[PDB]
């Protein structure tokens, strides 16, 4: 209610928020994976999968 931004920047911000909320404790989270050096399992998180549609599609691979 106390906001003036549009759905786009708000969606980006909420995606970042969720991605940070995954910064907690417990396996399947990014800290444990870093400790195990499982840099690959991060790519398959669900949060990046929800923020992906926001990426520029014509240059998302690069």
């Amino acid at each position: 209610d106390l906001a003036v931004l549009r759905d786009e920047k708000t969606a980006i911000t909420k995606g970042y928020e969720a991605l940070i909320k995954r910064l907690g404790t417990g396996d399947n989270d990014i800290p444990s994976l870093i400790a195990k050096k499982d840099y690959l399992s991060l790519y398959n998180l669900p949060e990046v999968k929800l923020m992906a549609p926001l990426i520029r599609p014509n240059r998302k691979g690069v």
């Binding site: 520029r56 599609p57 014509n58 240059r59």
Partner: protein, 61 residues
């Protein structure tokens, strides 16, 4: 060169002639300015840019 005299091509002021005649073959220059773009109707809202950032643009933009 310029329109209304399209049958001429200046080279250091030396006017040269075209062996042909055209009234529309030249009128369509929407693709002779940039490579993968096309001119469109004027819009001040659109932001000014350079030749480098063009690579990171999308469509309908």
């Amino acid at each position: 060169w310029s329109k209304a005299d399209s049958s001429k091509i200046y080279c250091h002021g030396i006017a040269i002639r075209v062996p042909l005649v055209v009234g529309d073959e030249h009128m369509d220059t929407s693709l002779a300015l940039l490579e993968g773009f096309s001119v469109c109707e004027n819009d001040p809202r659109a932001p000014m840019v350079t030749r480098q950032d063009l690579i990171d643009v999308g469509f309908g933009q």
